[PDB]
């Protein structure tokens, strides 16, 4: 029943975009001509981070917005102190090849993914001494592309194997796999209520995934390349979506549409890290140019470039307050804006 | 006469484009790779080296103002000392870094592995340190037996001066002949044969041994060698030629005046070496393509 | 304050320790494999064994070398290629052998047309433009004995040559270095796999240590 | 290294 | 037998996917600009912080 099935498969396909047109009355862009443009928010580098001598491909911003944790491909997971420019923890990797970094909410434990399909779990205090491998999660056969603190015991990541999976630290078991993806999970958010999230994957597609049910709640398609970035907006009803052909696109969940487009003409380059401000207005790229980009989440005017980086900006995260915004580079430095 | 002023008046111009140009260049240098570059064992040679051209050119005014107004020193004891102390450690630091790079070449072009496996930037700065106090060491001298001496005729030079060191003046005479000798000779053998057979010898083994390992893609690293070697040679060879001679034949000279050219030739070889002090970041820094990327990115 | 100098004093103890656990990973030769369709991965860290990826740590002649096979990894190569982006070499594996034969997933592609399409990725690869191949021709024992029974022309059709082992290895290995095109910035060093005891291991290091001298003459300047 | 003259 | 199977997910899931109701867009779009505009004030990055109050000064 292929022919059968084909046609069944494109005319609910043709459904979903004949719905989406009656529901499309005008973009957001056109109903945000009087809301007054921000300005030039003209970010500096309070505060500089070096130590690392290898490239950092990923960085996470905790609750208390003081520690953040770096993930850099020299084998060594430091516990940076933004506040005096510390580095409160070291913790080596028994594999280099790291691409992804979370840390807990409630600062207890951190992950780290890569090549190695091993999510490394550490435990922050070891009052025992120093620094160990608590959980090593192995049920992925594909790099580990992005990993989240969801609570103290459950932890999604995302894989190069075209599946998502929610992992318990204690058992260190799959409680759920996220499956529909075609192209392999390049990154993930987690929604502020962690009862929602979405996936970034290589076919150009986001889906909206349920923690609880393992049911996929929506898929998004408006990119025509790799998604190698994604970030809930703060309020958890809409999400941003870097894509390889400098082209940032909003998703509102309730809209089920593609809200507006952020790309410009002069941006040709990839974007690999895409960051929401504590109010959303500021749509914070990370791009291949060597330098960030802020964007006006309701205008699509560039408001201003973080121009500090020597080579291509690999991460980039906005702490919780919104106090600092913190932006890692190929270049093994980390950049303090604020 | 008519040459002689020209060749009089040329080394003052050549003293001032030596400084602007060395300034400027140690400056980019400096900016560029001990602040916006990473900190590498070939980064801390090139950061040394630029750092001894800079404190060099940046004294080298006082030496112009010196050589235009015939040797003669108007400011004070104290400056003459720190200008001629700096001007010193600055030539004998940068030739020695020169000997330092061309052997850490060599080491890292013949034996690859250990230049892998022990090349770090601790040890980088622990074995650079050496120069530096070898070039204190023979400083020291310099240290202690120079100061400014005043003609009766009213006129200042500092130059050195043996009044308290020997009682009598027949034992100041002969001491003063006997330190003089002896810097010649340790300025001919560490300053100058030591490095110039190290770098010939350094230089020569990487051009032997990428020839026999058929590694001659292209004419720019045999042009880079041979305009290094042969813009030091002839650089350097002159001037410390002229230094033995002034040694060897300093005592027919204080006693009977017999040979006068050697005098006027050391403000051409002097400018010369200067110059090299000058293009030394020109022909071991600049050449890097990273160097030249880094600096375009700079601005 | 005591708390800060505490502190203080931590972040030094971490930046020493930095330094000698960054020093003993910039010591050790980064190597990468590829080669899909049992091109002869498995046999070749057999070899150079004294000690998603398997990191086969060895050092030979006092200098160690960290060898990473990616072979497990079955997603989008682009994605992660990057991350070898600074390896002193790349050890790319081929069945001799290959030539007849087809891939077990499409029953109409080459074997060693495949090969070739991704040696072609690596080569003008813009991670890769100034990392040296060290290609590695697998099989070399067997495909004597299969090359007079089959002929090579079944591969490339645009080949008369003649019907030898030496001929028929030759034009193989001057077909990859054709294929190249970053000319006058990397070298495809190429041997053939040798049941000899320390050949296979000599000629890697032997190729690395050319290409650490290309890299310390490169940053010397004189490149 | 640098010369100096003798009065 | 198993590529029948698999397809089949496809559209179920696209069926399922297509039974939720879709929020209009107009006062979708609407709430995003009254969170935006509610915590501009709280959010530093909008509005430039004095270096007394932030600890990057």
């Known amino acids: 029943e292929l022919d059968q099935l084909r046609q069944e498969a494109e005319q609910l396909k043709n459904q979903i975009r004949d719905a989406r047109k009656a529901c499309a009355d005008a973009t957001l862009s056109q109903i945000t001509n009087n809301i007054d443009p921000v300005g030039r928010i003209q970010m500096r580098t309070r505060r500089t981070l070096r130590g690392h001598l290898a490239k950092i491909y990923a960085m996470h911003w905790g609750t208390d917005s003081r520690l953040l944790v770096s993930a850099s491909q020299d084998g060594k997971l430091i516990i940076w102190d933004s506040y005096t420019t510390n580095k409160v923890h070291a913790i080596p990797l028994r594999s280099s090849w790291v691409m992804t970094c979370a840390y807990a909410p409630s600062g207890n434990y951190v992950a780290c993914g890569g090549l190695d399909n091993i999510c490394s779990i550490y435990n922050l205090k070891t009052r025992e001494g120093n620094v160990r491998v608590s959980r090593e999660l192995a049920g992925h056969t594909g790099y580990l592309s992005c990993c989240r603190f969801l609570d103290d015991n459950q932890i999604v990541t995302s894989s190069g194997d075209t599946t998502c999976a929610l992992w318990d630290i204690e058992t260190g078991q799959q409680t759920t796999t996220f499956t529909g993806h075609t192209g392999d999970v390049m990154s993930l958010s987690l929604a502020p209520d962690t009862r929602l999230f979405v996936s970034g994957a290589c076919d150009a597609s986001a889906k909206l995934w349920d923690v609880r049910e393992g049911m996929c709640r929506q898929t998004f398609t408006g990119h025509e390349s790799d998604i190698n970035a994604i970030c809930f907006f703060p309020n958890g009803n809409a999400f941003a979506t870097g894509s390889d052909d400098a082209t940032c696109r909003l998703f509102d969940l309730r809209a089920d549409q593609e809200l507006m487009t952020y790309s410009h003409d002069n941006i040709i380059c990839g974007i690999t890290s895409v960051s929401f401000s504590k109010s959303g207005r500021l749509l914070l790229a990370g791009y291949d140019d060597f330098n960030c980009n802020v964007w006006d989440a309701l205008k699509a005017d560039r408001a201003g470039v973080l121009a500090g980086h020597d080579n291509r900006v690999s991460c980039l995260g906005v702490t919780d307050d919104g106090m600092a915004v913190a932006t890692g580079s190929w270049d093994s430095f980390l950049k303090i804006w604020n | ?299 | 304050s005591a708390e800060d100098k505490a502190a203080a004093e931590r972040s030094k103890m971490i930046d020493k320790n930095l330094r000698e656990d960054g020093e003993k990973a910039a010591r050790e030769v980064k190597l990468l494999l590829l080669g899909a369709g049992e091109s002869g991965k498995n046999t070749i860290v057999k070899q150079m064994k004294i000690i998603g990826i398997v990191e086969t740590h060895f050092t030979f002649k006092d200098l160690h070398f960290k060898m990473f096979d990616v072979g497990a990894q079955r997603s989008e190569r682009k994605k992660w290629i990057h991350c070898f982006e600074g390896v002193t070499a790349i050890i790319f594996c081929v069945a001799l052998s290959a030539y007849d034969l087809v891939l077990a997933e499409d029953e109409e592609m080459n074997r060693m047309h495949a090969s070739m399409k991704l040696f072609d990725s690596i080569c003008n690869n813009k991670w890769f433009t100034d990392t040296s191949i060290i290609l590695f021709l697998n099989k070399k024992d067997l495909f004597e004995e299969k090359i007079t029974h089959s002929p090579l022309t079944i591969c490339f059709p645009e080949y008369t040559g003649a019907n030898k082992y030496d001929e028929a290895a030759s034009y193989i290995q001057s077909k990859f270095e054709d294929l190249n095109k970053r000319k006058d910035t990397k070298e495809i060093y190429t041997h053939f796999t040798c049941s000899t005891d320390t050949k296979n291991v000599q000629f890697v290091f032997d190729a690395v240590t050319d290409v650490i001298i290309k890299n310390n003459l490169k940053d010397c300047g004189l490149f | 290294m640098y010369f100096i003259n003798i009065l | 037998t198993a590529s029948i199977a698999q397809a089949r997910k496809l559209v179920e899931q696209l069926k399922m996917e297509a039974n939720i109701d879709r929020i209009k867009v107009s006062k979708a779009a609407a709430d995003l600009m009254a969170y935006c505009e509610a915590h501009a004030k709280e959010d530093p990055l909008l509005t430039p912080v004095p270096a007394s109050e932030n600890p990057f000064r």
Not at chain 2, 165 to 174: F, I, M, Q, V, Y
């Open chain 2, 1 to 299: 006469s008519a040459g002689y002023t020209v060749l009089r008046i040329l080394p003052l111009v050549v003293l001032g484009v030596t400084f602007v140009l060395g300034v400027l260049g140690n400056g980019l240098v400096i900016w560029v790779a001990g602040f916006r570059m990473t900190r590498t064992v070939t980064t801390i040679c090139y950061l040394n080296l630029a750092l001894a051209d800079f404190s060099f050119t940046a004294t080298l005014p006082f030496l112009i103002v010196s050589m235009a107004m015939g040797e003669k020193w108007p400011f004070g004891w104290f400056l003459c000392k720190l200008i001629h102390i700096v001007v010193d450690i600055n030539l004998f630091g940068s030739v020695f870094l020169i000997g330092f790079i061309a052997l850490d070449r060599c080491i890292c072009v013949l034996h690859p592995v250990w230049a892998q496996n022990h090349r770090t930037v601790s040890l980088a700065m622990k074995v650079i340190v050496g120069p530096w106090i070898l070039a204190l060491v023979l400083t020291l001298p310099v240290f202690l037996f120079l100061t400014t001496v005043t003609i009766p005729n009213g006129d200042t030079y500092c130059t050195f001066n043996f009044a308290s060191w020997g009682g009598t003046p027949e034992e100041r005479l002969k001491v003063a002949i006997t330190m003089l000798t002896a810097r010649g000779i340790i300025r001919f053998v560490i300053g100058f044969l030591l490095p110039m057979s190290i770098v010939a010898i350094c230089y020569g083994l990487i051009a032997a041994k990428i020839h026999k390992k058929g590694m001659i893609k292209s004419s720019r690293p045999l042009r880079v060698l041979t305009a290094v070697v042969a813009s030091f040679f002839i650089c350097w060879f002159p001037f410390q030629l002229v230094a033995l001679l002034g040694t060897v034949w300093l005592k027919e000279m204080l006693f009977y005046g017999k040979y006068k050219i050697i005098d006027i030739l050391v403000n051409p070889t002097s400018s010369l070496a200067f110059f090299n002090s000058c293009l030394n970041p020109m022909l071991y820094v600049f050449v890097g393509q990273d160097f030249r990327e880094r600096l375009i990115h700079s601005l």
